[PDB]
Design an enzyme around this catalytic site. Structure first.
Site, short mmCIF file in Angstrom:
data_model
loop_
_atom_site.label_atom_id
_atom_site.label_comp_id
_atom_site.label_asym_id
_atom_site.label_seq_id
_atom_site.Cartn_x
_atom_site.Cartn_y
_atom_site.Cartn_z
N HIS A 254 -7.26 -1.74 5.91
CA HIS A 254 -6.39 -0.73 6.50
C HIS A 254 -6.26 0.47 5.57
CE1 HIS A 254 -2.80 1.02 8.21
NE2 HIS A 254 -2.30 1.01 6.99
N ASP B 148 5.69 3.07 5.48
CA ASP B 148 6.22 1.78 5.91
C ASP B 148 6.24 0.74 4.79
OD1 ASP B 148 3.34 1.92 6.39
OD2 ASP B 148 3.47 0.14 7.66
N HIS C 233 0.86 -1.19 0.00
CA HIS C 233 0.00 0.00 0.00
C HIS C 233 0.89 1.23 0.00
CE1 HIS C 233 0.07 -0.52 4.45
NE2 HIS C 233 -0.23 0.75 4.53
N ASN D 243 -3.10 2.08 13.01
CA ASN D 243 -3.26 3.45 12.53
C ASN D 243 -4.38 3.38 11.46
OD1 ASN D 243 -3.20 6.02 11.40
ND2 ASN D 243 -1.01 6.23 11.93
N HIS E 7 1.53 3.80 2.12
CA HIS E 7 2.12 4.45 3.28
C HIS E 7 3.64 4.26 3.32
CE1 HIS E 7 -1.98 4.30 5.57
NE2 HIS E 7 -1.91 5.33 4.77
C1 LIG Z 1 -0.31 -0.16 18.61
O1 LIG Z 1 0.16 -0.94 17.55
C2 LIG Z 1 0.28 -0.28 16.33
N1 LIG Z 1 0.03 1.00 16.23
C3 LIG Z 1 0.17 1.63 15.08
C4 LIG Z 1 0.54 0.93 13.95
C5 LIG Z 1 0.72 1.61 12.64
C6 LIG Z 1 0.28 1.25 11.35
C7 LIG Z 1 -0.61 0.13 10.86
O2 LIG Z 1 -1.69 0.00 11.57
O3 LIG Z 1 -0.32 -0.41 9.73
N2 LIG Z 1 0.72 2.13 10.46
C8 LIG Z 1 1.43 3.06 11.07
C9 LIG Z 1 2.05 4.15 10.47
C10 LIG Z 1 1.95 4.37 8.94
C11 LIG Z 1 3.24 4.84 8.31
N3 LIG Z 1 0.85 5.28 8.77
C12 LIG Z 1 0.85 6.71 8.96
C13 LIG Z 1 -0.47 7.17 8.42
C14 LIG Z 1 -1.17 8.38 9.05
C15 LIG Z 1 -1.57 8.90 7.65
C16 LIG Z 1 -1.23 10.35 7.31
N4 LIG Z 1 -2.13 11.23 8.06
C17 LIG Z 1 -0.64 7.83 7.05
O4 LIG Z 1 -1.30 5.99 8.37
C18 LIG Z 1 -0.49 4.84 8.56
O5 LIG Z 1 -0.85 3.71 8.61
C19 LIG Z 1 2.74 5.00 11.33
C20 LIG Z 1 2.80 4.74 12.71
C21 LIG Z 1 2.18 3.64 13.27
C22 LIG Z 1 1.47 2.79 12.41
C23 LIG Z 1 0.81 -0.44 14.03
C24 LIG Z 1 0.67 -1.05 15.25
O6 LIG Z 1 0.91 -2.43 15.40
ZN LIG Z 2 1.23 -0.44 8.50
ZN LIG Z 3 -0.52 1.82 6.37
#
Ligand SMILES: COc1ncc(-c2c(C(=O)O)[nH]c3c([C@H](C)N4C[C@]5(C[C@@H](CN)C5)OC4=O)cccc23)cc1O
Ligand SMILES: [Zn+2]
Ligand SMILES: [Zn+2]
Length: 232
Positions: free
Chosen positions: A150, A89, A85, A181, A87
Site C-alpha cells: 500500500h 490515518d 505508515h 487508496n 498517511h
Molecule cells: C473503498 O474502500 C476503501 N477506500 C479507500 C480506502 C483508503 C485507504 C487505504 O486503502 O488504506 N487510505 C485512505 C486514505 C489515506 C489517508 N490516504 C490518502 C492518500 C492520498 C495521498 C495524498 N495524495 C495520501 O493515500 C491514502 O492512503 C484516505 C481515504 C481513503 C483511504 C480504504 C478503503 O477500505
Molecule cells: Zn489506510
Molecule cells: Zn495509507
C-alpha cells in the site's frame, strides 16, 4: 452491540473499541477525506500494566477521543505508539499523543515520508526494519517490514501471545473489491510483500485490515487477488 462496527455506525469524532483476544483490542474511528467518510482500524495491546498503541485514530480530535475511550473501557495508560505508515490515518494525532505523554515511534522511512508530505511526525525512529523480511520486537508485538505494498514504508504487526496479525493498509478486508487508496502504492510488489507475510505468519488466527472487518488468513490471499486484478 457486539458485531464489528462499520462506517455508518460511527459518527466522525467518536471511537469504538473491539476486543480481539485477551489483551488485544482494535480501535475503529471514521474520518472525512475528499468528501467521503471512511472507517479505519488500529490496535491496542496490553503490555503488563501499560498499553501499546498501533496507529492513531485518523486525526487530532479522533485521537483525543481514542485516549478517552481507552481510559473508560480499559483504564491503563498508553505509554508508546507505533505508526505503521506515513498517511494521516496512521500518524494524524501523533501530536495529541505526544502531548499526552505517549512516546511515538515509526520507521525512519515513515518519518521521512511524513515530514516530506506535511503529516505529523513520530518522535522516535525504529531501526532494524529497512529490508523486506526484517522483524524486530517492540513490547508485546513483533514489527515486520514485508516490502512495498500500500505504501513503500508499510509495517505489519504480530501479537504472538494471541496469534493476531494486524496488516494495516497492506491488507484488505474480504468485502474489498478494489485496492483502496493506491496513490502511494507499489502494485507490482504488493503481491510479493503479501506472500512474505503469508510465509512469516502461518499460525495467524485473526487478521485485521487497515480498514474494515477482521477475518482469518484468507484476507491475505484476497488482498493479493484484488491488487493483481486492480492492476489488470
Ligand atoms: C473503498 O474502500 C476503501 N477506500 C479507500 C480506502 C483508503 C485507504 C487505504 O486503502 O488504506 N487510505 C485512505 C486514505 C489515506 C489517508 N490516504 C490518502 C492518500 C492520498 C495521498 C495524498 N495524495 C495520501 O493515500 C491514502 O492512503 C484516505 C481515504 C481513503 C483511504 C480504504 C478503503 O477500505
Ligand atoms: Zn489506510
Ligand atoms: Zn495509507
Amino acid at each position: 452491540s457486539g458485531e464489528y462496527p462499520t462506517v455508518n455506525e460511527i459518527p466522525v469524532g467518536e471511537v469504538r473499541l473491539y476486543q480481539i483476544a485477551d489483551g488485544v483490542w482494535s480501535h475503529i474511528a471514521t474520518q472525512s477525506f475528499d468528501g467521503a467518510v471512511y472507517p479505519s482500524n488500529g490496535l491496542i495491546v496490553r503490555d503488563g500494566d501499560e498499553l501499546l498503541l498501533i496507529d492513531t485514530a485518523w486525526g487530532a480530535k479522533n485521537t483525543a477521543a481514542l485516549l478517552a475511550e481507552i481510559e473508560k473501557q480499559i483504564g491503563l495508560p498508553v505509554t508508546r505508539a507505533v505508526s505503521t505508515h506515513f498517511h494521516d490515518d496512521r500518524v494524524g494525532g501523533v501530536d495529541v499523543l505526544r502531548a499526552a505523554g505517549v512516546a511515538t515511534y515509526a520507521s525512519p522511512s515513515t518519518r521521512r515520508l511524513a515530514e516530506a508530505e506535511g503529516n505529523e511526525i513520530p518522535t522516535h525512529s525504529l531501526e532494524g526494519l529497512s529490508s523486506s523480511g526484517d522483524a524486530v520486537r517492540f513490547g508485546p508485538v513483533e514489527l515486520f517490514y514485508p516490502g512495498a505494498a500500500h505504501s513503500t514504508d508499510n509495517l505489519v504487526v504480530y501479537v504472538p501471545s494471541a496469534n493476531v496479525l494486524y496488516g494495516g493498509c497492506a491488507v484488505h478486508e474480504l468485502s474489498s473489491t478494489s485496492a483502496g487508496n493506491v496513490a502511494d502504492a507499489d502494485l507490482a510488489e504488493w503481491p510479493t510483500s503479501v506472500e512474505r507475510i503469508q510465509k512469516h505468519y502461518p499460525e495467524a488466527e485473526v487478521v485485521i485490515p487497515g480498514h474494515g472487518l477482521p477475518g482469518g488468513l484468507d484476507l491475505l490471499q484476497h488482498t493479493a487477488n484484488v491488487v493483481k486484478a486492480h492492476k489488470n
